[model samples]
Target: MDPETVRIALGLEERTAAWLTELDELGPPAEPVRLPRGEEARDLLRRLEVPELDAEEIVAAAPDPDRDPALWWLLERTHHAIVRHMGDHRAKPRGGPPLPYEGGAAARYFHVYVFLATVPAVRRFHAERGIPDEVGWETLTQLGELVAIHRRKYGQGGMNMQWWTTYHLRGILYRLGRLQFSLATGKDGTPHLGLHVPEWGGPLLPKAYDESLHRARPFFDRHFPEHGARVAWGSSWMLDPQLEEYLTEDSNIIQLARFWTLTDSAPEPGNADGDSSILEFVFRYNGQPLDELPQRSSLERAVIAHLKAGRHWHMRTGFVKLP
Candidate 1:
């Protein structure tokens, strides 16, 4: 509510205000670390390069996936506008007008153009014109745009494994059941997109081991099966063979699963204070639970490496603090 506080959060009071004031003027610090690849990606990239087509004309020809590749590029750029108008700069304290979901102008604009206008257009493309799962680039690209903006506004989004699995990717694939993604490494050597639903396995897996395992085994085999022992779930969830005993059903730690998505009635600045039931730490020490122990994981340490280097934000929900 304070103007100075708001200005500081928005970068308006900073020395970099000239560029910060207009985010479209700001771009990726360098070429983006990841871009779509493969012959299909190449085709789509070229399709996006034509300069004469504008967003409206592109939308008017909607439900045609090829025609809309250009639309996705514009959507990415439109997301940049939202980033500028909202205060999501890495170097600054984030404060801005309320978010669109929370009833702000910036968010409303996003909902209309990106979600309402373009998303259905892409959906229509899938239904009216058939595409094999391989050319499902538009779906991936559209969801990637959502992931980009949500991460900007909220510390959690596509970048985090947990958020991507439960909400972003899971939500989209739920709507478009035909789409499937798998992890592929980019030139930078980081894991990237490949594309799914479900009932909780707690009750079913215990009683229906043969049937449940039969159903579940194929999921891993189908997606990222090559990763074998390297399988990671949600952002931080991992299947470490060393910790197998600690992960059994009915384990107290397993009981805490419900907290993974709990919401505190009041929303905190940056949304850190809510989701209080989350464990601040996930590792144990000699004969003690996380609450009783004070140890950290190699993963947590790596997360800190990113934070200090400014590659990651020191958000409340993230690794900087241990319970």
Candidate 2:
């Protein structure tokens, strides 16, 4: 990492600390983005402003809390925390420690967090939570993970940082989420939090915001096999839409119908060596034919875009090559 990035990351940590203090008042909440669980998280968020006496009202209205008080508390804390830590900031790289090139992105999950926050789901989630279209605790923590520090190479705890620091980080965004909600919805400010990705190309103020939604294609395939999943998968979609098509159409991509998780044994970084070795992935199934045309077309388009503009994709791989 360069000196500049290190500086940015340090500022991010301070911002995180300030956000944490704000979330302290709301109590802690579980992750609202996890599968099957966010549904409850969503409800808890809806109930944050309701007085404790109104808990009965919520129970009477929603009625699933009969067997879930402690659960509700945890859920409420989560909602509160999410709304508190709702804002965006840049994460700088730390120069104190050298980053390992192998398993690059895997090791530096924090770096990825910044990018994840720029997605659509996260954006809309915050907009809905904040009155004036602000982000929340969960979203803030999610954004913090975008920094690369948490994904330290050869470090065991690196991968688990997000889980361990969940409460602290989530608290910040949640409080902010609530404040923004009041500002926008209650006070007459704009309700929509617009996209703010730099790569999208536009103004620099307010920092472009975007949402992060997990593609449920694999989930759909697993539960509804007969339906045939109708969606694209992976972060590659952010950088290359054609890459999405290749995954959607390729026979090999179809093999992983039953499983929802996707992994690459040896992923090559797009910036290393000018070209890379085999770009491979394993799916849930094994019966499929090799088709290279679409993959080629996608690669060609991304390459053209990259060359035309001085831009690059945040590839998660050990090798930083282009092919």
Candidate 3:
């Protein structure tokens, strides 16, 4: 075994019980996982917009399926985890396994291969259902977006979105314009079209919201007939009614709040930390010092000042019916 290579690849500088147990759970792949290599692999990375140097490093570090037992096990298992659940939104994918160096070099790059390997399975799944190729790849391309977000947030070149991207890889959630939708279960334990406002690009205006919502109704009607409801519910800090204390009635958030019948099923205010989410989404922060948060926008001002006054923000739930 290449002890040093494995050490770096797995980030074995230190170990955790969960990481050890995850390794124990590892086994042979249900099916072989094919790692993209050389130019063909480069093409996929390019589509995802992974930076040039980082992409080259990852491609060079491609695991030897025959020699590297742990990485091979994880790659095949994680790839099949999504492939096996294709088109089954009801299937909740357990992450492949947690690596020791989630923040380290090779270990950080390792998870990217898992997603890359699943691409063909996801594309094939969509093709089998007559799903458009553009929409299909667009959803998968979120891998690139995830990579970009990681770069922006952590100032590094790798991925840490294993748990969340499974939904997209398995043909469940989708990105449409400015909004994202999922076949999500509600607090009542019934499936509802889950709406999500992704923190991507520019202010989320009503016109853009309407266009995305308008696009969702038929997209699901065509692809996810099992999810037959026109109603979609989303939970976010933006839905917190208290924002009206700081924001105007015509503001995009307030207007969006008006669209949903906000629900009470969420945890009481103290139990949920919508303040953290508000900071993370608006300011790319998680519970730093109060004065460290910026106030370039009105929303930023509200988030910081509201909390400064010894107030707490709760993640609120709201439901919207597609028009």
Candidate 4:
């Protein structure tokens, strides 16, 4: 690895771990809350608690620590950016309008798909609150560039989670740009594409995994034997948070695993939830709870276990137990 990449990787190890610490300190706002913990990987993910802890005594305890306003915006920006690019993909000829195949038709279809797709779940999520207008072309170009670069660096695995994460990060970036634009222009700046929804006034992703990656430099170097320039990627099912729902890394991986088992497909709604059966399989597979949010000690235990077991670990998706 170049000195710069090495430095970055090292810095990231600490920075990401700090983020995770913050996450544990601040969980999410959900019915059954998840808490934060730590891990040793390029990037590790621990569920952050969400919502007020409900006691059996028929009273919800003093609302969970008030969510930090700044963090909330940060989390939403991360989320919005990832969702922005989910739908705008199309066949754009060289030098043609991006997604050049009848822009209006694709745009309209994408709009409808986006519009209807989230309709059923609107009640579940706070939707229709604040809307943004559009994302600038320059921002889109930069985001596309970043995604392309990362994809080139990271092997494009044949798995659904693999592809989803690939695009999801870009989506987050797109959403972030839109948010920036919205703030600057005071406009609705929501992208026309379907996947990215501009969610306002919601809490953000707790940074557990970010912290793990930060704390993993020495761990990675000590554990991950230099494989002679073999393009090694970090993380597995635990993708960066911008793409999927709130901090459900464990559930996300479990769900994707089952989704693939049924249809050999991933979460591609562009294909019309075409693999509904597969998705159903995923839901069924994830019928019960995944192991709870591990604490620092448990996180250490998990990492040590993986290392002792000699499995090649990827940090982003946080997959392990694979040869």
Q: Write down the lDDT of every candidate, Cα atoms only.
A: 0.30, 0.29, 0.74, 0.25
* Residue pairs in collision within model 3: none
Off by more than 4 A, model 3: 1-26, 51-54, 66-68, 187-189, 265-269
Predicted structure 3: lDDT: 0.74
Give per-residue CA lDDT, model 4, range 108-215, as digits (tens).
Answer: 122112211222222122122222223222222332222233233333211112233323223222233222111111124322112121222232232432332232
Per-candidate TM-scores read 0.28, 0.21, 0.85, 0.18
- Misplaced by over 4 Å in model 2 are 1-12, 27-154, 160-239, 242-323
lDDT of 1: 0.30
In candidate 1, what are the lDDT values of residues 108-168, reduced to their tens digit? 2322233322332343443433534433343334433333443443433221222232221
Error of 3 at 268 (Å): 4.3
If both were scored by lDDT, which would come out higher, candidate 2 or candidate 3?
Answer: 3
Residues 258-314 of candidate 2 have per-residue lDDT tens digits of 222333343434454222211211111123333321334454444435434543333
Q: Which ten residues in a row have the lowest lDDT in candidate 3?
A: 15-24
Q: Of the pair 1 and 4, which is ahead by TM-score? A: 1
Tell me how many residue pairs clash in candidate 4: 45
Worst 10 residues of 1 by lDDT: 314-323
